[PDB]
Design a protein around this motif. Sequence first.
Motif, mmCIF file in Angstrom:
data_model
loop_
_atom_site.group_PDB
_atom_site.id
_atom_site.type_symbol
_atom_site.label_atom_id
_atom_site.label_comp_id
_atom_site.label_asym_id
_atom_site.label_seq_id
_atom_site.Cartn_x
_atom_site.Cartn_y
_atom_site.Cartn_z
ATOM 1 N N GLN A 141 0.076 4.193 5.696
ATOM 2 C CA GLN A 141 -1.127 4.864 5.289
ATOM 3 C C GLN A 141 -1.436 4.640 3.841
ATOM 4 N N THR A 142 -0.419 4.635 2.965
ATOM 5 C CA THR A 142 -0.666 4.465 1.516
ATOM 6 C C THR A 142 0.215 3.358 0.995
ATOM 7 N N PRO A 143 -0.044 2.090 1.390
ATOM 8 C CA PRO A 143 0.918 0.979 1.040
ATOM 9 C C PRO A 143 1.087 0.668 -0.449
ATOM 10 N N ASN A 144 0.023 0.711 -1.269
ATOM 11 C CA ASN A 144 0.157 0.366 -2.686
ATOM 12 C C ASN A 144 1.076 1.378 -3.403
ATOM 13 N N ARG A 145 0.846 2.664 -3.153
ATOM 14 C CA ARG A 145 1.698 3.685 -3.744
ATOM 15 C C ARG A 145 3.129 3.586 -3.194
ATOM 16 N N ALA A 146 3.284 3.544 -1.869
ATOM 17 C CA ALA A 146 4.610 3.434 -1.249
ATOM 18 C C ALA A 146 5.326 2.201 -1.814
HETATM 19 CL CL LIG Z 1 -1.702 3.718 -1.943
#
Ligand SMILES: [Cl-]
Length: 162
Positions: A141-146
């Motif tokens: 769902q939140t790949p850049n942050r993860a």
């Molecule tokens: Cl993200």
Amino acid sequence: MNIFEMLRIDEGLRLKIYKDTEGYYTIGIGHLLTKSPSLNAAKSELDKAIGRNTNGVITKDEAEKLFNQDVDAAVRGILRNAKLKPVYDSLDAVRRAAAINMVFQMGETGVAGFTNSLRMLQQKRWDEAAVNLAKSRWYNQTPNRAKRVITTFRTGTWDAYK
Ligand SMILES: [Cl-]
Ligand SMILES: [Cl-]
């Protein structure tokens, strides 16, 4: 760099009620107000949080006050949690920051569900933990942050934040 700067990068700062990446009313630096679909419910949670009649708007000082409380709460949630605590204690100071980031984002229960990852983190099998952390709704769902958090757990440096 430190936990406050890390989270400020990942969460941003907005001074009026907005919806987060899941659609929930939030304000400030990632301060979730309510999962209820009611903006009125959010406004009332906000007034109660800040201690005045905000009409959905807060100041920068007020945002940073909630932020300080939320970081502190996240830390205290890790130390009180029998599954999180021994992993966090095993970690160096940079990777401790990554753990707090995760708890901040998804709650102590959410993170305590990463049983296999937590075990690999405790054993300091960094590449394997990073692979396992990414097989998650969180990562999809939140790949850049993860990716930034996972990289921090993998390297124990702030490279993903520089
Ligand atoms: Cl993200
Ligand atoms: Cl609060």
